[PDB]
Design a protein around this ligand. Structure first.
Ligand SMILES: NC(=O)c1ccc[n+]([C@@H]2O[C@H](COP(=O)([O-])OP(=O)(O)OC[C@H]3O[C@@H](n4cnc5c(N)ncnc54)[C@H](O)[C@@H]3O)[C@@H](O)[C@H]2O)c1
Ligand SMILES: NC(=O)c1ccc[n+]([C@@H]2O[C@H](COP(=O)([O-])OP(=O)(O)OC[C@H]3O[C@@H](n4cnc5c(N)ncnc54)[C@H](O)[C@@H]3O)[C@@H](O)[C@H]2O)c1
Ligand SMILES: NC(=O)c1ccc[n+]([C@@H]2O[C@H](COP(=O)([O-])OP(=O)(O)OC[C@H]3O[C@@H](n4cnc5c(N)ncnc54)[C@H](O)[C@@H]3O)[C@@H](O)[C@H]2O)c1
Lengths: 476, 476, 476, 476
């Protein structure tokens, strides 16, 4: 079973006024599975009016009641994990097992943020005149416009949504048209748990028309976007033209520094498993594997065997560990990346081709002998491709790791305290994981530097983009 | 005695490569008093190269050394405050007494920030696996491009500068061409204190050309602007287009709520004093006086008396209490404001005219019976004009206070806990002062919401726009 | 139904090795209702060995798993609220309605602390040498010995227990022999939710023998006591002799300052309702009512009518709003207080006598015209007695409020911001509530100054007594 | 040149009312060099009355003024450091170079704490009812009684003093009778800087009589002791009996773990240097050297060489690197320690004897082959003796490090992240230094666990024992 998806406006699942829809396809087969409403300006207007009202209601609900309502929604998400996972796999491609992991980690996210909303603390400042009380109070910024991508349909919504609700803002999101049902189910849990009419809204349609209307509108006080660097720059540019608060999680290009002293088997297992997660369609996916020359050959061979062990297929079939890529553009993007690697003299150690003629299946691929000018070492591939290059000195791996304008995630494998410390200071990334894969828990900051954007989506720092800070000084 | 001004590039005071200069005029006379170097692109390229290596040097100086160096700069600023104040008064117009208070408080600000840099703390998070250490590390974002205006030539540079230096960033500021000598004496204190070559740079010239070149440049990792709403929109847009971190301190339109239970004498002395500070040329200048009908007329007469007691004249005369406006565009703007007020049926209770035919002298002015559609009640006057309206109910005054897209400062006068609490929760401002004038100590956040911008320039919060936050997890 | 109570040692409900028990009485009738095991030194030894083991296990369980186990126990407490309330009312005396409130607020407490255990943050300090990492880590102190009283049998356990478990300490408590079943049910929820063997223990017996053995024993690293000031001083003295960490919540003697501008009806309702809560057997119960002379007579008369409206009786019978006092000593203590008031010239405005000849029923009592040397104005009465005295100047009410060595809770009623501010600065109390009764939520600090003891039992400060702080500096 | 010492009471240097004095002797010669006033009860009563009104004055001085005054004191301490150091060396014995470093670092400590007092922040908590403001306010606890020992006559006073003054407390210290002039010059700097009359007081006499009188006295709200474990037990017991807040910094017995992968030359230079600092008369002096068997013998020989290179002599000679021990009871104690070591079969590798027959000179000593039952491996030697033992496995060394009831400082030498992480989580100490000697900067917490005491004397945590925390909730 796969369901058609509607807009959520003012507590009501509704069609667009025009009645227009967009078709949704299963990327494992290319076959239509359902449809989603395509919003016009008139539905956005109704959504903006409701977000204004929702904001006025939700800001007045004490943090401990907001928190309990969020926790109920999380319990519902958790109760419905199987059904939501099933929707997600059909629209997006990832294996059922990975979809369930994402839905459960959404529940965990909502819960931590629920509790953090109760710890949005002001402060009292020792005063220069004891007749006066000097305070700093924190309040919600106002209605949020959010724009989220298809690669983790639920999780890319839930951090933003959980942050907005915990601070007491209202929230209007344009979820992905290619993966609409799983996020709509996430929103439905919040409605079912008691979040009032107007506090949350959900639209789909033409992304550029929606973001062009929403971002400049006087109801919206904060914009949040997760996506590509080039669309991020257009949106941050418009947000600045209209003096809106904005945060952005954009491309990454994660380096992986496997040092001379690394546990090599651990590196292959950790960084290899993390590469093929969601078929590499992850903003923090390990991409540029910088491997000390003493162990490069051993690493490369073991990474190749890891890729060869993956079972490619429809994400509903058990045994599947690597599903369809999410859409046909991702297939074309992979061929372009592979063609360019071969042209510039790199070696395809395994994979490198489409599998079959139906759906978006690409083989897990490992590329070695990669020169610095290959597309795979410069543009974010966002697909099931690891690129390996050797180095002799740790300092040259670190310079390579910082060479690109991306800087989101970084990985390393090493045993010495001095190398940890050096990597910690020197690597230009938002997030660094050593001797393990990415474990991006809600309590941990999650955000970029440079072209990867700005603003955190974890920790207490995740509430700051949704808050205004007010200095209040009262003389008795 | 007034001094020509040069660029500060790589530890040296230098002319522009071209030899071009711009004339500086005394706004009390219209007469040339000196000139400032006019940078072109070649000078900016040298400033940027120096800023890069400066960032690389300064980020390695431990915090406690950076603090001690900053405190040395502060002590020199304190000692030279009267000679710096004489420069400021000549180029900008404010009375000497105000200029001294500005410069002495610059020293106070440097000291607080020097100490704050020793408290940029990371976090250790209780881990999900006890075999890993999860930390949150803070580090300087990089070279900063700062753009500052003429109203507080020193003070608008000093918080930005101190924040940059306390975090380990390097700093390149374009200070105002019409008030260049006093900001250059501020940077000189720092050079004399031992801030190394390239860590600070100062340039002057064509604002648009410089900002268009600096903001997109790869060296600049962060932008900070203080000035008008419409210019900040243009710059935050450019900054968005090149994915640069940006803070913005923009227009205000500060309401004053004088409640039924207010002490009227206090309200006039506090808010009337604050209105005519630097001739209203202040982003936090009280502008819209909303006075409870029971005391509207009594307040209006007392504010009229306050304004008629100011002594208008050259700021170098020590008894001068209202100097010349900073520049001729400010006279033009006061004429338009008063003209519209008269045309919409408001009453000019005092002032309303230029004084003399030389310099930029405008009389301190009070406007009563002001309709909500008057320019003075919608656009930021930025000059020595107060606008008075009545109200019956506190909640009508709060709604008027929140009508405008501006939201920087607010003031109120009241004695009940209930009113204090209400004004605290409901007024859409970044800073609220109750029963006293503005006291923006460095330890207190200072920043806007809505069209007034974003980012704070006081408190620990002042450092965050200059920091990047990095999640580090290391499995042992 | 009322059940006999056993010791909890190493995951097992067990009898004492001697087989000794103590009888439990219903204070509403004087009739035996059950019994509780009476521990000897040999059972304590087995308890201390298990706490050592429990500490070694529980310290290794990640904060997010500890947190989920605590939340389950809270859900169980909440599921069993009726059954636990019933036990409590029979052993302790309070009305069923109030017992249910306490059990539910216990669940709320456990939950907030569960979440706070995940936010025991270390920090990273900017280093004096960048080659070195300077960190501050937080770890559990070790096994706790706790000693809790009969007045809120569950709540006096739950803050201490929740704090210890959230930090990762083990916990051994000696609960009250006169009210053992309700706390034992609280502990049983934690066993049922999965807290491992040894992490929690529960003993009863002779309090002085237990605290004399536990406090000096090398397994115990932290002592916590809630009780009387004189027993607190003996226990803190012994804890210091053995260099143990100790916190103490001791007597209060709460002032209530009803100022000239008070809402009088609000004062009677808030402070009057709070006085007769748990029949005044509360460490923060409003006791010394300092009332401005203009409204003293009106206040006194309305407080008298509030007391006269209470329905005294068995706590299981519906309609009951004031139950039996908890034990016969409390009845004797009340007569002594009333006899002394009459002897020193005060007036008994209502109540003042035992009701009936069975059980521990005392009438709700209001005393006026109280001189400063009455026992009720010096010793903590801990019973259903309010004592009223007038004042003319707010400064003399404040001096009276600070006259005694107690300082736990304080109350006031006033409308002006200046009075709030003055009271906030000047009143020597741990907790001050204005214009409302006590709402001691888990997120709020709860602790004394002076003879009322030290250490907080709310907020993040509640974890600090259960934590050690370790500076770690590692040179690369 | 050495100066007799007086009491500091109410802004005046005075004799005891009685005229009694105590002789002060130079420990390098046994010869009188001056005398110190010997307070009786009447002097203490005047000190306490002054401390009370001092507390009332100082708590009203805004933080920023208190800071500026403290910084002035710091500057005077810096300027006078060499004259203060000459006093210290004569009365206490340490080399002049060490005495200068102690006094210069006292100035650094005052400065950090002065700034920290401006950051004693309260909290605003998100309320359960939006009509109330819930705040957490911090305020000084009250007059402090401080008791300090002879080992760092200045430095043991300065953190306590600075913490007291930064929070708004008044401070009355009993400094050591055997080293009285240098602490009195520290208090003089503060008097000269403008700390008002009564805010500080200094007394000398009979330690027991003074502590027995001060600790129970109603004026004293807080006690702080640094000294021996057995004396601190006696004082923390007395403090408990009168319900006074207490902090305690007591004995240490610092392990040094030299791991298999350690740099031996670094370990000897860092830990060997630290052992013979102030002749081992330091609560954090490395004592139990636990060295991996592969390098035990090499470490032992190198430490022997380090010790034989010290230059023993009068501390006034600038080339002296090990001075006389502070007092004759310290010789007696070194003789007992060495004697027991010999009797239990340990080997004296170097030193082991008194040098000369005048003064308190004891040779730098290294003991190897030390059994676990030797006095030197159980009791704090507090003198110039290192005790060496081997180990095979890191976890046996950790268990030995944790065997003793002491837990102040620890040291280790190792290069692997795994070992660093393990030592961090498992070593029962308050401070751990890895690959370097002790660097206890004021910004870092400094305090023990178990028998070494409680309370921190660095970091923000240093202020908490001098603060009370007050929950304030005000319903509007
Ligand atoms: N950071 C991330 O997690 C993330 C997510 C999705 C895609 N991407 C990057 O971009 C590529 C995405 O490919 P794509 O084919 O989806 O192309 P795209 O660049 O057109 O899409 C980027 C995202 O922005 C949205 N979008 C596009 N134009 C928009 C507008 N004008 N207003 C609002 N939203 C708009 C899309 O719905 C999509 O989710 C990937 O290869 C990857 O490198 C990154
Ligand atoms: N504290 C403040 O926030 C502040 C300060 C000065 C002016 N203003 C506002 O601006 C109004 C008009 O000011 P004005 O007469 O200086 O005119 P303006 O708006 O042309 O200039 C405003 C400021 O921005 C700068 N600026 C202008 N264009 C720029 C560009 N392209 N790049 C970089 N910097 C640029 C100027 O150097 C000046 O300091 C004032 O009346 C007031 O409302 C606000
Ligand atoms: N930094 C420290 O923590 C520190 C400092 C000095 C001594 N000690 C320990 O104490 C041992 C012996 O020291 P000692 O020879 O000075 O003998 P001691 O134990 O008699 O004195 C220790 C300190 O406590 C003080 N003191 C003693 N009785 C007191 C009382 N009743 N009230 C108040 N203060 C009192 C002394 O003035 C002295 O400063 C040392 O060898 C060492 O183990 C520790």
């Amino acid at each position: 079973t796969y369901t058609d998806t509607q807009l959520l406006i003012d507590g009501e699942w509704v069609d667009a006024a025009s009645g227009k829809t967009i078709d949704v396809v299963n990327p494992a087969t290319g076959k239509p599975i359902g449809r989603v409403a395509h919003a016009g300006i008139a539905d956005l207007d109704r959504a903006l009016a409701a977000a204004q009202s929702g904001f006025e209601a939700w800001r007045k609900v004490p943090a401990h009641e907001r928190a309990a309502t969020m926790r109920k929604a999380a319990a519902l998400v958790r109760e419905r994990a199987d059904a939501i996972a099933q929707l997600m796999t059909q629209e997006q491609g990832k294996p059922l097992t990975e979809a369930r992991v994402e839905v459960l980690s959404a529940a965990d996210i909502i819960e931590w943020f629920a509790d953090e909303g109760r710890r949005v603390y002001g402060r009292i400042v020792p005063p220069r005149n004891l007749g006066a009380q000097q305070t700093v109070v924190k309040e919600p910024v106002g209605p949020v416009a959010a724009f989220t991508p298809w690669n983790f349909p639920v999780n890319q919504v839930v951090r933003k949504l959980s942050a907005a609700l915990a601070t007491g803002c209202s929230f209007l999101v344009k979820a992905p048209e290619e993966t609409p049902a799983s996020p709509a189910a996430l929103l439905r849990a919040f409605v079912d748990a008691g979040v009032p009419a107007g506090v949350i809204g959900l639209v789909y349609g033409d992304p550029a028309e929606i973001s062009s209307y929403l971002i400049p509108h006087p109801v919206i006080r904060k914009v949040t976007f997760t996506g590509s660097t080039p669309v991020g720059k257009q949106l941050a540019s418009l947000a600045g033209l209209h003096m809106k608060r904005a945060t952005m999680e954009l491309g990454g290009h994660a380096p992986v520094i496997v040092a001379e002293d690394a546990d090599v088997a651990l590196a292959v297992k950790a960084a290899g498993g993390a590469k093929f997660r969601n078929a590499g369609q992850v903003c923090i996916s390990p991409t540029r594997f910088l491997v000390h020359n003493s162990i490069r050959d051993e690493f490369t061979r073991a990474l190749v065997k890891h890729a060869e062990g993956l079972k490619v297929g429809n994400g509903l079939e058990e045994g599947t560990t690597l599903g369809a890529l999410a859409n046909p553009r991702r297939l074309t993007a992979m061929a372009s990346v592979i063609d360019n690697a071969r042209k510039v003299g790199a070696s395809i150690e395994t994979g490198g081709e489409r599998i079959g003629s139906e759906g978006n299946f690409f083989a897990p691929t490992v590329i070695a002998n990669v020169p610095l000018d290959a597309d795979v070492f410069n543009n974010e591939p966002f697909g099931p491709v690891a690129a390996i290059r050797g180095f002799d000195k740790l300092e040259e791996a670190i310079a390579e790791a910082n060479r690109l304008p991306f800087g989101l995630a970084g990985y390393a494998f090493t045993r010495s305290f001095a190398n940890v410390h050096l990597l910690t200071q020197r690597l230009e990334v938002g997030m660094l994981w050593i001797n393990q894969p990415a474990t991006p828990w809600p309590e941990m900051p999650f955000g970029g530097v440079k072209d990867s954007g700005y603003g955190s989506e974890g920790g207490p720092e995740a509430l700051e983009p949704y808050l205004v800070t007010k200095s209040v000084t009262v003389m008795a």
